[PDB]
Amino acid sequence: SGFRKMAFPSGKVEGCMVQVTCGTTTLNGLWLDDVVYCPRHVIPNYEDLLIRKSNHNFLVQAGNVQLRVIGHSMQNCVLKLKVDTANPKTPKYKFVRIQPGQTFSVLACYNGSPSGVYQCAMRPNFTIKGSFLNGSCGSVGFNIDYDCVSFCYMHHMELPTGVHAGTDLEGNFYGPFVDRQTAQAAGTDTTITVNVLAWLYAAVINGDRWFLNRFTTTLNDFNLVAMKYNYEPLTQDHVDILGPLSAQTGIAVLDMCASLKELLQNGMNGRTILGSALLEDEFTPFDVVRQCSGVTF
Amino acid sequence: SGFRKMAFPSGKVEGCMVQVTCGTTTLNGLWLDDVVYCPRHVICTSEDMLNPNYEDLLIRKSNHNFLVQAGNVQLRVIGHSMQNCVLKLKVDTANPKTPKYKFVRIQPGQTFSVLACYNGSPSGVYQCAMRPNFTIKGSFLNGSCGSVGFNIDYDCVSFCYMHHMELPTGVHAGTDLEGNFYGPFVDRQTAQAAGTDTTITVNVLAWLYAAVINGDRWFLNRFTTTLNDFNLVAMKYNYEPLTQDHVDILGPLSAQTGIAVLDMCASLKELLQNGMNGRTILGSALLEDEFTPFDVVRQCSG
Numbered sequence A: 001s002g003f004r005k006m007a008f009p010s011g012k013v014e015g016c017m018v019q020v021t022c023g024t025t026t027l028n029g030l031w032l033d034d035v036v037y038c039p040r041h042v043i044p045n046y047e048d049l050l051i052r053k054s055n056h057n058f059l060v061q062a063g064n065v066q067l068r069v070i071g072h073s074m075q076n077c078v079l080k081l082k083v084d085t086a087n088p089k090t091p092k093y094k095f096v097r098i099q100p101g102q103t104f105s106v107l108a109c110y111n112g113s114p115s116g117v118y119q120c121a122m123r124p125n126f127t128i129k130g131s132f133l134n135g136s137c138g139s140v141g142f143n144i145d146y147d148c149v150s151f152c153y154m155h156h157m158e159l160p161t162g163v164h165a166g167t168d169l170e171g172n173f174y175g176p177f178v179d180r181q182t183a184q185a186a187g188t189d190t191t192i193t194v195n196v197l198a199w200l201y202a203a204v205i206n207g208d209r210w211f212l213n214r215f216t217t218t219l220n221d222f223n224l225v226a227m228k229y230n231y232e233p234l235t236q237d238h239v240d241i242l243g244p245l246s247a248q249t250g251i252a253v254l255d256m257c258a259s260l261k262e263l264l265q266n267g268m269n270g271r272t273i274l275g276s277a278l279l280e281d282e283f284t285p286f287d288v289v290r291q292c293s294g295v296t297f
Numbered sequence B: 001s002g003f004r005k006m007a008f009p010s011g012k013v014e015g016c017m018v019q020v021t022c023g024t025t026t027l028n029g030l031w032l033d034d035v036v037y038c039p040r041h042v043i044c045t046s047e048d049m050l051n052p053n054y055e056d057l058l059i060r061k062s063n064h065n066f067l068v069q070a071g072n073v074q075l076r077v078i079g080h081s082m083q084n085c086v087l088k089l090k091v092d093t094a095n096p097k098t099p100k101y102k103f104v105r106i107q108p109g110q111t112f113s114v115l116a117c118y119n120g121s122p123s124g125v126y127q128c129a130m131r132p133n134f135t136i137k138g139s140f141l142n143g144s145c146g147s148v149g150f151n152i153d154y155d156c157v158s159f160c161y162m163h164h165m166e167l168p169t170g171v172h173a174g175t176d177l178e179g180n181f182y183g184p185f186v187d188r189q190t191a192q193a194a195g196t197d198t199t200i201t202v203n204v205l206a207w208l209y210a211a212v213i214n215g216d217r218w219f220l221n222r223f224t225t226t227l228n229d230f231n232l233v234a235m236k237y238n239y240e241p242l243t244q245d246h247v248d249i250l251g252p253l254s255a256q257t258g259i260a261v262l263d264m265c266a267s268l269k270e271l272l273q274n275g276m277n278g279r280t281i282l283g284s285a286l287l288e289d290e291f292t293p294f295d296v297v298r299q300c301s302g
């Protein structure tokens, strides 16, 4: 029993966190094998600014040991500092680009030191509601798949509303954001519907059944309602992905959709679901399964 | 900007997680130096649990009865002792990944990270608090016994909790790393139940100071209160009494925001009275009590 916002164990990522200094700027780097990846804004014609930099301009620090940079290249908005020393703690890893609605763990770092780990989701508006202070640039987002760390995010900036923007580990920004000093704003955000339904299945598994009803709905009727409440449209793939939880609890996906339809029109009415007075959208259907079955890393 | 329920990086604890098997039972152990710590109920059967005599059951045990597994490598148990409700399996190999650590006993209201494990493998990390009724609202399945709670301030891991059981309400009871249970709980199948839970007032105020720092001022008011008037109101909403110790601890937050503690107490009073009225504080429609004043400072400063 119990339901918590749970992150992946951060250990495999911790051994990869380094400090990257260039001039007056100090941020974080991800040291994998003999390459250290970091936001290119550490150095805006970025090809022109990078041509003026020398290898000894980048001071890379792994704990106490200083690493010597032997090369540098740029891939989209990530800088790739080739170092002489390969990371002995390099885990089995992949660079994956996640879709909006997908969740991941963020190991927030300052001066190459991990300060905390938290779970968050890629919002439909391509921002992440993270927790970052100055110096957190280069902190990474990741998932663990068996014994493989899938790096999906590198923090670059904070938007004027306090939400965060960053890139995948190939330097491609999530959303219409750029690493240039200009006016940027997060677009209108929507609720991740498949995740709310997954979190409702986790509540049923945990004993919370008050919100259930005898009703069902069509996928079209549900989406017409969901659209009015700024909820993401629920596709047939979302209905298919929720199948295992639907089987485990005995509540059909459209049956739970009718529960959500009533929750949106009528509300909670003083009641809570998993100790929350709002509908939670930062647990994917796989997160609910992993937590309510006991998958390990 | 931003405010999240943040856990300590679990890496230092991950290298200490081992599998402990004794008979039909498989749970988790914490391998520090040449000792593996685990709940002593690993030696019990389900029938033994009603009225177990642990000293009696431990005397019948041989070192080879405990199968300790660290990853793939099986560890050899060379001794065993019991300290309160924790079993201490002396092993012949010291943990090379042993971090700088302490055994700390926490007070209710204190928060910590839990590295939930199954079969000696870490499955996830989450943040939670020691409730005033001495239970923790964790996320645990069967096989999680031996999972630990910890704080990693500076380069030292302070182990403060070891999971032992789930109570009938779905909440959890455990011990410090010296085997002393938190609360009036025993590692015996009895009619024990968690007492009435209360909201950790000092933590709600700390989380309100985090909201003010983050730009949220809607809940503030032109009122102040006495500490006694606040406690008389707080008690009626099942809130923990706010002591002078709590008022002193909130001082740095009060100075940083410019809002006196009894001033923020008057804001809390009005929120208990009125409710949120469609509004949220740090993206929450409820008043959060699982961030201590130390958590708020660390996250909003460094």
Ligand SMILES: CN1CC[C@H](C(=O)N[C@@](C)(C(=O)Nc2cncc3ccccc23)c2ccc(Cl)c(Cl)c2)C1
Pocket: A001, B041, B049, B140, B141, B142, B143, B144, B145, B164, B165, B166, B167, B172, B186, B187, B188, B189, B190
């Ligand atoms: C289905 N079996 C019936 C009894 C078994 C049972 O509960 N056993 C344990 C070990 C226990 O609390 N384990 C657990 C821990 N955390 C979370 C749990 C979530 C679910 C199920 C067990 C969970 C236990 C039992 C009685 C006592 Cl007094 C103690 Cl100290 C420990 C389960």
Ligand SMILES: [Cl-]
Pocket: B105, B106, B107, B110
């Ligand atoms: Cl404490």
